[model samples]
Target: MNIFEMLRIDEGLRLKIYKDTEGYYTIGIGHLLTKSPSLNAAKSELDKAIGRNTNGVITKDEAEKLFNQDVDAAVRGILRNAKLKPVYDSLDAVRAAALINMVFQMGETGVAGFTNSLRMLQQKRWDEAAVNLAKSRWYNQTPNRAKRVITTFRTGTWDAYK
Candidate 1:
């Protein structure tokens, strides 16, 4: 089923959808769905939704609606929280894929979720990081998506971000 249909989003609204049964418009699981983002927006929003599902992406005007803000800001927030530099310092294809995939799931908090993964990643623990990747609750939440993302991370295919 489509993401919207899966979430029971029968009608699409710009900011909020009004349900006739209820007097006021309902947020519906409150940002638990994706807003049909463009290519880049999709990747970034994925990162934001990982840890915090409270607020969806507002402003930026990129897509009609998104659960979080933009992708770059999400990554920036994650890097800031970890107080680390971009993985470009080492830049392994698989590692990048994993990190990006993780960001997709964990949102900005995905990076923080990896206390051990961060240590391994910083110490060049590729194998261990991959193992750590499997340890997350997100690993099973979206299995097919997880597989595709993890595979992309392992293979270093940044093209998906495009």
Candidate 2:
């Protein structure tokens, strides 16, 4: 088996935080050093942010399992709560994933703020939608990420994005 399967097997799937052999607070398959001073060694901003315990711990299995529900909810919520539901509904899998990415990056309210982009999409103006997406702060601030989605959105394929 691969490393992830080994991790799943070795760690077991408990959703609650629990004490291990040591006294440190840990959750998710052996994601150690949560409350320990060792978390100071983290390099990434995400690692530092997570060390702050904003959401606390979760089982790795549970976290992976929860992704489906969360993504589905995000998609459903976007469809029901947006003016561009028609375009969203008509989108192929690649473009739909791009739409979901935007919603994931920007929450419902933030996505709702894409008024002009939504209108363009609703009018079936693919170029305008692509242009609008690229022109936004979200695009400039996260060019590489936006590029993946933008390329896919424009080409209707997951080739480079994948």
Candidate 3:
């Protein structure tokens, strides 16, 4: 599966605002509304995107737009990291998606903290990379999603979708 499909499955679409696992206000396929610079600004953007005052609800189309924008931001963030640039550039599409997925879940700075894991990935040591990922709080907090992402990295395929 492609990155979009993988993310859709992992994040799960929501039409209304709800609390995420971390108890943060979220909406539209894992968009952390609470994490925005300001909730008012975020709501204004959502309202504009939907062409109406959302009042916490968004259409599927609007949600897709938000998802796409979030993914774009994640990709740009990954590319902007000097240490991650060469590793990201060296990866194939599937492996690249795995990297983007991690950055999407956690910010680029968060993922960058995985020094040994990044080193393993840079060396093309897929198994070692996966192992390092599993030993994290992320894996413990979101085991299923983390498993799928780690599996994608280890196998370099869409096997995670299965």
Q: What lDDT does the true structure give each of the candidates?
A: 0.45, 0.59, 0.87
lDDT of 2 by residue, 1-162 (tens): 222332244344544445555455544544432445443332232234344343454435455554444456667878787554766887776677777766654556777788887777666677778888888887887687677667656777766433
State how far residue 94 of model 3 sits from its true place (Å).
0.4
Q: Cα lDDT of model 2 overall?
A: 0.59
Better of 1 and 2 by TM-score: 2
Top candidate by TM-score: 3
Off by over 4 Å in 3: 36-45, 48-51
Task: Tell me the lDDT of model 2 at 124.
Answer: 64
Candidate 1 residue 130 Cα shift, in angstroms, is 1.6
- Which residue runs does candidate 1 get wrong by more than 4 Å? 1-69, 83-88, 92-98, 158-162
Instruction: Choose the strongest candidate by lDDT.
Output: 3
Residue 90 deviation, candidate 2, in Å? 2.8
Q: RMSD for each model, in Å, please? A: 11.5, 10.6, 2.1
For residue 6, give model 3's deviation from the true position in Å: 0.3
Q: Model 1: per-residue lDDT, tens digit, 49-136?
A: 4443323333323222443333344446556754334453465644453554345335666556557766666776656666766777
> What is candidate 2's CA lDDT for residue 126?
78
